[PDB]
């Protein structure tokens, strides 16, 4: 009964993303009110991803020395403290500290859970099958975070969403203490193929680069689209929110379908087609004149990104099993880093380029870069 571990990682990802998307609208308003009663806000937004990026390799090295369960339970304890600090703290320094601890706990959870999933489901097809479901938790959390936070802030109070999240985190921790049972410290068997040797591999580099560019696309699209919308179409407030919902729905559908469908078609071909489709959709985005023109390209973007992730997350596993020692916590530490890249320099770099040249040229450059990198996935094909 290893489905409990899958449920644990699914819940961890879901709750992490729920907190991430719940905290996003509340912080700018009351922070500005307290200042009354650009650089710092960008620093606050990027601190979580920066700290996660910095602490990924250390978790990758520590899971080899002590194992997965102790790092996972620490992810529950840091995320519980971050959720209670977010609920009770109202100053800038305490906010920065909470967002940074959230980053540390999210690094622990992501790296250790992906390593444990890869080590428990050692079959090649089942690995992708379960990683698709686990990646679906991110989409579910992003989808259900904003409405949950909005209603709970609307009716009960400001601290109510955070207290409810804390109760759910406690339930998750109780389940973890029942099944995971992190009582003693157990070392792993063999060595870990140090990061310096793994970073010289061109195939791992190609997979990581594909993930990084595919995610940086949406990471720079998401905060730069409403600014263009309000100036071109003069859209209303709710239309700014409902326009990016097709991306979140299509990501869920595409992940859950292609986690199973990528093995039969070919992981390299699925990644190549995902790159081509996301590039074409980003290129067609600037031509839209009203919300209905934007519905379809967003669906294409989400579908393609789901394809790419659900094909390239299980391959990072297959490449170390094939060319290195079968220890996963340090290779997934690389993969997670790719994600953090998109979340670290995404919004800031996207803003400056858009002010300097314009938004259609930014989208054209993203699309051209994705289209040109797509042939590189041809080298990822299995030799037989
Ligand atoms: N790595 C998946 C990122 C992603 C895919 N679809 C999304 C929709 C909204 C969002 O904030 C993020 C995403």
Which tokens belong to 30?
């009351």
Specify the ligand 1 atom closest to the Cα of 21.
11
Q: Has 125 been labeled as part of a binding site? A: no
CB < 8 Å & 24+ apart, contacts of 132-135: 132/255, 132/256, 132/258, 132/259, 132/260, 132/310, 133/6, 133/10, 133/256, 133/259, 134/6, 134/9, 134/10, 134/13, 135/13, 135/255, 135/259, 135/306, 135/309, 135/310, 135/313
Identify the CA nearest to 86 among candidates 10, 11, 30, 130. Answer: 30
The C-alpha atoms of residue 281 and residue 183 are separated, in whole angstroms, by 50
Alpha helices in 67-200 (DSSP H): 69-88, 92-120, 124-155, 160-179, 195-198
Query: What is the residue with the minimal CA distance to atom 1 of ligand 1?
Result: 215
Whether 198 and 321 have beta carbons less than 8 Å apart is answered as no
Cα 316 off chain centre by: 16
Q: Give 89's DSSP letter.
A: -
The C-alpha atoms of residue 127 and residue 119 are separated, in whole angstroms, by 9
CA of 302 to the centre of ligand 1 (A): 7
* Tally of residues, the chain: 384
Whether 87 and 163 have beta carbons less than 8 Å apart is answered as yes
Whether 217 and 303 have beta carbons less than 8 Å apart is answered as no
- Residues within a 6 A CB radius of ligand 1: 138, 142, 215, 218, 222, 247-248, 251, 302, 305, 309
The helix (run of H) or strand (run of E) holding residue 107 is: helix 92-120
- Give the list of residues 6+ apart from residue 184 with CB closer than 8 angstroms, or none: none
CA of 248 to the centre of ligand 1 (A): 6
Q: Is 32 exposed, middle or buried (0-12, 13-18, 19+ CB in 10 A)?
A: exposed
Sign (positive/negative) of CA torsion 318, 319, 323, 327?
negative
Q: Has 256 been labeled as part of a binding site? A: no
Whether 173 and 76 have beta carbons less than 8 Å apart is answered as yes
Structure determination technique employed: cryo-EM
Specify the resolution in Å. Answer: 2.8
- Give the list of residues 6+ apart from residue 52 with CB closer than 8 angstroms, or none: 103, 104, 106, 107, 110, 336, 340
**Local structure of 200: helix, strand or coil:** coil
Sign (positive/negative) of CA torsion 38, 369, 54, 187?
positive
- Phi and psi at residue 89, to the nearest 5°: -90, 150
The C-alpha atoms of residue 126 and residue 363 are separated, in whole angstroms, by 36
Whether 89 and 23 have beta carbons less than 8 Å apart is answered as no
Q: Has 203 been labeled as part of a binding site? A: no
Specify the ligand 1 atom closest to the Cα of 250.
6
The C-alpha atoms of residue 162 and residue 152 are separated, in whole angstroms, by 9
Specify whether the backbone of 74 is left (phi greater than 0), alpha (psi in -120 to 50) or beta.
Answer: alpha
- Give the list of residues 6+ apart from residue 61 with CB closer than 8 angstroms, or none: 192, 329, 330
Whether 78 and 70 have beta carbons less than 8 Å apart is answered as no
CA of 223 to the centre of ligand 1 (A): 12
Whether 48 and 100 have beta carbons less than 8 Å apart is answered as yes
Specify the ligand 1 atom closest to the Cα of 305.
5
* Ordered structural domains, the chain, with CATH: 1-188 (1.20.1250.20), 193-384 (1.20.1250.20)
């Amino acid at each position: 009964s290893r489905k409990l571990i899958l449920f644990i990682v699914f819940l961890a990802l879901l709750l992490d993303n729920m907190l991430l998307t719940v905290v996003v609208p509340i912080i700018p308003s009351y922070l500005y009110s307290i200042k009354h009663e650009n650089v710092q806000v960008g620093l606050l937004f990027a601190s979580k991803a920066t700290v996660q990026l910095i602490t990924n390799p250390f978790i990758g090295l520590l899971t080899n020395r002590i194992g997965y369960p102790i790092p996972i339970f620490a992810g529950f304890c840091i995320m519980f403290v971050s959720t209670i600090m977010f609920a009770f703290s109202s100053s800038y320094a305490f906010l920065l500290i909470a967002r940074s601890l959230q980053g540390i706990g999210s690094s622990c959870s992501s790296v250790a859970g992906m390593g444990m999933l890869a080590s428990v489901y050692t079959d090649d097809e089942e690995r992708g099958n379960v990683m698709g479901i686990a990646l679906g938790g991110l989409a579910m959390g992003v989808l259900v975070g904003p409405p949950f936070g909005s209603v709970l802030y609307e009716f009960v109070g400001k601290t109510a969403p955070f207290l409810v999240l804390a109760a759910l985190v406690l339930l998750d921790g109780a389940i973890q203490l029942f099944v995971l049972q992190p009582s003693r410290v157990q070392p792993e068997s063999q060595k870990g193929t140090p990061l310096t040797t793994l970073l010289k591999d061109p195939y791992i580099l190609i997979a990581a680069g594909s993930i990084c560019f595919a995610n940086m696309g949406i990471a720079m699209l998401e905060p730069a689209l409403p600014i263009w919308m309000m100036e071109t179409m003069c859209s209303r407030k709710w239309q700014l929110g409902v326009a990016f919902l097709p991306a979140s729905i299509s990501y869920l559908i595409g992940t859950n379908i292609f986690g199973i469908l990528a093995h039969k078609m070919g992981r390299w071909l699925c990644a190549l087609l995902g790159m081509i489709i996301v590039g074409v959709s980003i290129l067609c985005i600037p031509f839209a004149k009203n919300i209905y023109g934007l519905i379809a390209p967003n669906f294409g973007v989400g579908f393609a990104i789901g394809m790419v992730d659900s094909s390239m997350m299980p391959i990072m596993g297959y490449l170390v099993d094939l060319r290195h020692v079968s220890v996963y916590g340090s290779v997934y530490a690389i993969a997670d880093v790719a994600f953090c890249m998109g979340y670290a320099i995404g919004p800031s770099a996207g803003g400056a380029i858009a002010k300097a040249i314009g938004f259609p040229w930014l989208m054209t450059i993203i699309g051209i870069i994705d289209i040109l990198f797509a042939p590189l996935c041809f080298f990822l094909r299995s030799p037989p």
